[PDB]
From a paper:
[name] is a major anticancer drug target which requires membrane localization to activate downstream signal transduction. Phosphodiesterase 6δ ([name]) has a beta-sandwich immunoglobulin fold which contains a hydrophobic pocket capable of binding to the farnesyl group. [name] binds to and sequesters the lipid of cytoplasmic [name] and has been proposed to deliver GTPase to recycling endosomes, which is followed by release mediated by the small G-protein Arf-like 2 (ARL2), allowing [name] to be trafficked back to the plasma membrane. The resultant lipid modification increases the affinity of [name] proteins toward membranes, where it is required for signal transduction. Here, we present a novel strategy for targeting [name] by stabilizing its interaction with the prenyl-binding protein [name] and disrupting its localization.
Within their HVR sequences, both HRAS and [name] contain a cysteine residue in the −5 position relative to the modified C-terminal cysteine. We were successfully able to cocrystallize [name] with C-terminally modified peptides of both HRAS and [name]. In the crystal structure of the [name] HVR bound to [name], the electron density for only the farnesyl can be interpreted. This is most likely due to the flexibility of the peptide, whose composition, including a proline in the −1 and glycine in the −3 position relative to the lipidated cysteine, could provide unique conformational restraints compared to the other [name] isoforms. As [name] has a cysteine in the −5 position, analogously to HRAS, it is likely that the cysteine would be in a similar conformation. We therefore hypothesized that these cysteine residues could be targeted to irreversibly attach an inhibitor to both HRAS and [name], generating [name] isoform-specific [name] stabilizers.
Residue numbers in the entry: 1 to 113, 117 to 150
The structure:
Amino acid sequence: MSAKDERAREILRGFKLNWMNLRDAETGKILWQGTEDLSVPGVEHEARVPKKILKCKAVSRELNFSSTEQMEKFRLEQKVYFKGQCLEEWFFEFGFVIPNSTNTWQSLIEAAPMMPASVLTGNVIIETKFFDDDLLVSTSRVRLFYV
Ligand SMILES: C/C=C(/C)CC/C=C(\C)CCC=C(C)C
């Protein structure tokens, strides 16, 4: 048990994702909402998303998170897994987080082009890794269903 393992566990304990939503970047139309904290590790989260998001060239994501702990360089690494095979990897940087602050984090996700929704549905896991700089804070997973 190292000082960094301890710091990582202090940030996670102080961390909470309050709400999240996806809109078609193009129209700004709201595709998916939810207030379930999908960043919580150790449990497989589920999300039923409209299969039209696969057609979106870009989707605008809003993350609303609270953090008791100060973070130097808060960033995300998200790997798109199809049947255990990584097809994509996104990188997002928020940067400095003020201790005991609530923050809205707007990220624009750019499209791959895609296998049809019917093939992908329930076979896609989004593996989100939660970093402060190069310190891994948490690893969480969400299984996607396209409806
Ligand atoms: C199929 C491609 C997409 C654009 C879906 C995006 C899904 C998410 C953003 C859920 C991941 C959860 C978080 C903790 C951010």
